[PDB]
Write a protein that holds these residues in place. Structure first.
Motif, PDB file in Angstrom:
ATOM      1  N   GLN A 100      29.169 -78.962  86.709  1.00  0.00           N
ATOM      2  CA  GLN A 100      30.219 -79.482  85.497  1.00  0.00           C
ATOM      3  C   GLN A 100      31.359 -79.068  85.806  1.00  0.00           C
ATOM      4  O   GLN A 100      32.822 -79.009  86.175  1.00  0.00           O
ATOM      5  N   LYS A 113      20.306 -76.334  81.225  1.00  0.00           N
ATOM      6  CA  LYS A 113      21.540 -76.396  80.480  1.00  0.00           C
ATOM      7  C   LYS A 113      22.650 -75.625  81.884  1.00  0.00           C
ATOM      8  O   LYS A 113      24.268 -75.975  81.548  1.00  0.00           O
ATOM      9  N   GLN A 150      25.628 -76.973  83.703  1.00  0.00           N
ATOM     10  CA  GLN A 150      27.343 -76.646  82.738  1.00  0.00           C
ATOM     11  C   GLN A 150      27.702 -75.807  84.668  1.00  0.00           C
ATOM     12  O   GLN A 150      29.060 -76.173  84.179  1.00  0.00           O
ATOM     13  N   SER A 183      29.998 -72.610  80.221  1.00  0.00           N
ATOM     14  CA  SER A 183      29.205 -72.389  78.907  1.00  0.00           C
ATOM     15  C   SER A 183      29.658 -73.689  78.116  1.00  0.00           C
ATOM     16  O   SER A 183      29.848 -73.113  76.445  1.00  0.00           O
TER      17      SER A 183
END
Ligand SMILES: CC1(C)c2c[nH]c3cccc(c23)S[C@H]1C(=O)O
Ligand SMILES: CC1(C)c2c[nH]c3cccc(c23)S[C@H]1C(=O)O
Lengths: 321, 321
Positions: free
Chosen positions: B60, B53, B57, B11
């Motif tokens: 990532q 998103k 994420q 997040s």
């Protein structure tokens, strides 16, 4: 072809009322509908369970459905906990429910959390298989309404993945009442054992419950619910186990009293249970039972896997592979 | 060897405070502890998420942990939703929690149901791997207390299956504070971007945030939190990225002012980020990333599968095969 989904609680043996009302009808509609019969052990543990009683009862339900004529090639018969998609999609739907929504379902050491949060797992049970119809009754209306609302919320917020189901039993069977309380439906969990005939009652004990059914001392064999619910209920059981039309039962016992009719029905019940329990024992004591349930599990997994993956993609869980 | 389990929320990008405090320490303790690093995407969706998103994420975070030196052979790095055991054991524990218990956790369209029911899924994340320690802080105390109480309840009501964990970080790193609010911890989600240095900030932007850190105009390079929290925080960052002992930073800058020290640190931060982001890009743009996460997933599945099966047997779910 429409898909039907039915959940089965492993918490008690079905009665002959459950066999006439639903199970015998499923033996027919499994040719015309794509049927799923799911023994919901993950719902059972929302209530307190003896862990050995639970594993035994699961096997018993599977053998009872097979003894009824549920065909594992025509239909899909499986155990809920063996298909991971159910709790995977149960969790996804839980995140879009509201607490207030769930608390309102409850109404229609402390209170186990499973009793508040099972409804989204019920919704998942159904939508994983693109179900069109669910064969349930009045007291599930709010549960299917939640299911439909969750499908709308998911499709609206993410994208079209899920299908809305409807409450429909394709061929309604007879309604069988309590043998010593003809105004109440028959239930497997009556405190008065004489009220119900279990599919695993001893065949001699069952014929005795036909004789102890509460009726007038004598009368005509005529179907009349409002005035003679006692004899009428027995007529419904007679029709249910012989498939003989009701008007044809009436003409067959024209000029007969209750004694001849109840003698004949007690014998019909005894014979039905003798044949049924022979099949039940052979499935229940067989090694093929595990093979049957394995194939059922694989059939369900292949279908619900694709649904879960579409949901995960729509919410952004996991990876793009 | 003790097992450690750490949950990672997809997040937000970790900051350099998170790297000095924890991530760099994990690169060392993964040799001495059996470490699990779980990207918890199923917890992320308890809060509203843009689905694109979220998938970005997740990738990532995995690339950031690998760029830090988390070794996929020494440790197990995986995505929570790819291991079905987590929601399977999350459901089992939910049935033994109480609603009141869960509502009290909340305190320490309407309110999403995931926010009430995630704590048992957190408990499952941990106990599936027989975890001994969890490296979290004060605001997780009640969550670990619930975990320990659930383990006791399960072992007491069924039989000994699960292990109780403890809150322990094996090697505490430095505490890095907000660059323009030295009394507050550094956070990735500050409304004042100058307060934090993201691990993915442009290396030029980061050096500028070292210069804009709020300090006296000049002084001694001495470690003194109560009187000079500004320069002291920067000393902590210097120590954290160079491993140079604090007393040895002090003697190195004896007779130096703030300008020389802050110039040097801005360059150290810039260099660290240049090397770190080169590794991050190569993992993040690589096809091997998916291979890495696949192997992580298989490692976790093999361990948590055995735990789930022991829980199912203890509650009577499924079949004896
Ligand atoms: C709990 C129950 C057995 C269930 C779980 N999952 C389902 C899916 C379709 C229909 C049903 C169910 S009937 C429902 C009931 O309250 O009787
Ligand atoms: C939500 C969170 C990221 C989490 C999920 N599952 C876990 C297992 C061990 C430690 C943690 C967690 S930390 C916890 C947090 O509130 O930061």
């Amino acid at each position: 072809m429409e898909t039907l989904f039915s959940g089965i609680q492993p918490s008690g043996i079905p009665t002959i009322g459950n066999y006439i009302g639903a199970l015998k009808q499923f033996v027919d509609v499994q040719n015309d509908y794509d049927c799923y019969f799911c023994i919901v052990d993950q719902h059972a543990i929302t209530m307190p369970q003896d862990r050995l009683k639970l594993r035994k009862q699961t096997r018993q339900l599977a053998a009872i459905y097979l003894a009824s004529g549920i065909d594992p090639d025509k239909a899909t018969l499986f155990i809920q906990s063996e298909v991971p998609a159910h709790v995977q999609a149960g969790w996804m739907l839980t995140t879009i429910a509201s607490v207030g929504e769930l608390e309102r379902m409850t109404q229609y050491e402390g209170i186990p959390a499973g009793l508040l949060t099972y409804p989204p797992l019920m919704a998942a049970d159904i939508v994983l298989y693109n179900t069109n119809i669910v064969p349930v009754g009045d007291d599930q209306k709010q549960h299917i309404e939640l299911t439909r609302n969750l499908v709308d919320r998911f499709n609206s917020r993410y994208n079209d993945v899920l299908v809305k189901p409807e409450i429909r039993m394709p061929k309604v069977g007879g309604r069988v009442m309590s043998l010593q309380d003809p105004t109440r439906k028959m239930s497997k969990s009556d405190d008065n054992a004489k009220n119900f005939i279990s599919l695993l009652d001893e065949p001699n004990v069952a014929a005795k419950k036909i004789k102890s059914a509460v009726t007038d001392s004598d009368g005509i064999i005529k179907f009349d619910r409002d005035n003679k619910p006692g004899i009428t209920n027995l007529i419904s059981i007679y029709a249910g186990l012989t498939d003989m039309p009701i008007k044809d039962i009436e003409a067959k016992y024209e000029g007969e009293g209750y004694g001849k009719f109840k003698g004949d029905l007690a014998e019909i019940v005894k014979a039905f249970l003798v044949e049924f329990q022979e099949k039940y024992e052979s499935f229940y004591n067989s090694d093929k039972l595990d093979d049957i349930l394995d194939q059922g599990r694989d059939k369900a997994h292949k279908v619900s896997f694709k649904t879960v993956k579409k949901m995960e993609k729509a919410m952004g869980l996991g990876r793009k592979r």
